[PDB]
Known about the structure:
The complex is a heterodimer. By secondary structure, chain A is mainly β. Chain A starts with a strand and ends in a 10-residue tail after the last strand. Chain A contains no helices and one strand. Chain B folds into three domains: about 1-145 and about 300-320, LAG1, DNA binding domain (Immunoglobulin-like); about 145-300, Trefoil (Acidic Fibroblast Growth Factor, subunit A), CATH 2.80.10.50; about 320-413, Immunoglobulins (Immunoglobulin-like, Sandwich). Helix content of chain B is about 5%, strand content about 45%. The interface of A and B includes residues 4 and 11 of A. The structure holds a DNA duplex. Chain B: Keywords: Acetylation, Activator, Cytoplasm, DNA-binding, Notch signaling pathway, Nucleus, Repeat, Repressor, Transcription, Transcription regulation.
Amino acid sequence: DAAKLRALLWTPPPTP
Amino acid sequence: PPKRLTREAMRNYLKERGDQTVLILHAKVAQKSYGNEKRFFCPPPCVYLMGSGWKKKKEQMERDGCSEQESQPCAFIGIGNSEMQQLNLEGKNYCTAKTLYISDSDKRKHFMLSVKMFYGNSDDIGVFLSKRIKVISKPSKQSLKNADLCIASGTKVALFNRLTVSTRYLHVEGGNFHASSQQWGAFYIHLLDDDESEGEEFTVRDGYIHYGQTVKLVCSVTGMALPRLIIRKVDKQTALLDADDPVSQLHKCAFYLKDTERMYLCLSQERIIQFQATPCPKEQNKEMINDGASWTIISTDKAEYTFYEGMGPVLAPVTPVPVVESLQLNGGDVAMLELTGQNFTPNLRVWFGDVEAETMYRCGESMLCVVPDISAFREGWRWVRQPVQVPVTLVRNDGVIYSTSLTFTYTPE
DNA sequence: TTACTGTGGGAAAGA
DNA sequence: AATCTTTCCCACAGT
Lengths: 16, 413
């Protein structure tokens, strides 16, 4: 079914 | 001189649960090799030795006189025993097999890896099988007709990037995503609706993953996720933004970070970063992406085997490890439990807590056992006064204990 | 420099 | 029929 989940976000840094 | 498990030994087991576990992590399909080619299985199948039981076993062997080399667990791996490759486990609880391949001389449509283990002094541990692996000719538009080649939302995938020495795998460690050369993660890939928004909480949908759709990748081990991504098909060095066919096993993909200026999931050596795509001249349904932005996708699987030496070292290997799939009540003058599963033998008994039950063997997949009377757990109870739940364990006649996650509960009438 | 080797693309062949 | 899979071939970028 459609489901509500939880996951800690980790966003990749922009290139140097 | 083999010893039956005693109730004292069982109680000690049940309060500690210091098992030895062998975990085999691997992909669900493998591309075959033609002629004299070797096309290596990728991601490399990985054997993990999990559980506190490994350290405990090592300490026991050394107390009894063994050197470090004699107590070192050793492993070899091969494909359907058609010759095995040695793995190196020294200094680590895992090893990867990076040069396995399968020749078209092998006609099998499916196979299993065999991992053969033993200690450095050659004491046998046994042979452990992976889950079934499907041979494919090469990666494929693909039809939903072959769901084994498609990728259902909510299943696990590995992701790798090739620049054979360059190969890196998406992996999470030290609280960050990175591109590892030594380990690979298995990530849930979840379909999201086109209009679902970023957040720690989000709604996922069922269905097969198609290019153009929005997905969340969630580490199966740490539970950490990347931002919303649009999975796109890759042709040579370009993302095709208009592609919308099903994602298939061992396809090259790109992951566009949704709501960014053409930023794609990209590696820079071990680092995971975002990197901006280059728009294409006359073909504006295409974007040119960094070489570190191209990822190969493949569904993964794992096999898990758990055992414990309840009466100390034994002569026989602990395998084949019996596995209980289901329990069912069963009726007569007293209650009985039907066990279904695999690798049962006539030398196994079912234990309920520290009580060994009368156990009958029907075949490798079926045992029947008699539920002990409640008074074996609660002194004097002539009926079930209150609910009492006890663990279900399989035990071999030389004292090897095979943990199950099953319980039995006595329930008042 | 030549030989060899996984890998990835594409053509030819068979399903 | 027509498309799809399987096999075969070979260039690329490194030992």
